[PDB]
Point group: D2
């Protein structure tokens, strides 16, 4: 036989479940930012190699 206790329990359960969802969302957000951190590092190194190639190209070819 349903009473107010049932709805109270449902409300608490929803509160807990939404905390869990927020935790999950936080972890996905940090996962995404770590992907971006790795991508930024890849760009830093790629750009250093590129800068070496520009330097080399202008040094070897004075007409450039």
């Amino acid at each position: 036989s349903m009473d107010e206790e049932c709805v109270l329990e449902a409300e608490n359960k929803k509160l807990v479940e939404d905390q869990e969802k927020l935790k999950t969302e936080l972890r996905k957000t940090s996962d995404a930012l770590s992907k971006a951190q790795n991508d930024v590092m890849e760009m830093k190194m790629q750009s250093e190699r590129l800068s070496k190639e520009y330097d080399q190209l202008l040094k070897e070819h004075s007409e450039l």
Copy 2:
């Protein structure tokens, strides 16, 4: 000569393309994080509304 310049250029261009791809990936990752933060703003609003309702219903 022109040969070495040609090869060097080919390499340089393919590296510019790698950098371009990397830039796109980075932007996409950051966009994903921003979407996630929108979700969390709504989720935390749901949490505080749930809490408030809990209080209004079951306390003085």
Copy 3:
């Protein structure tokens, strides 16, 4: 009812603190995103002028 009042006050202040942190975080991400788009534009100016350099001074 007193301890409930104290706990509620605390909880409320922490919700508002989290809300503020979420805004701070979206701001921080927009700053990062802008930085990345600026690098996209910059890297395009760089490859474009490299191309111009080779078109003008090579075969």
Copy 4:
């Protein structure tokens, strides 16, 4: 053709300068990203504090 040397010098300087600008931007971008990563860590901690307060609240007050 003195003009040629003029233009070529300017163009080379500009290429070098834009490499430098991209280098600077990369460093700053990484800084900005680290800030955001720490903002997310702060929210994890803050929401864990909120979870402890919610747990405690529901545990102490059966009517909630």
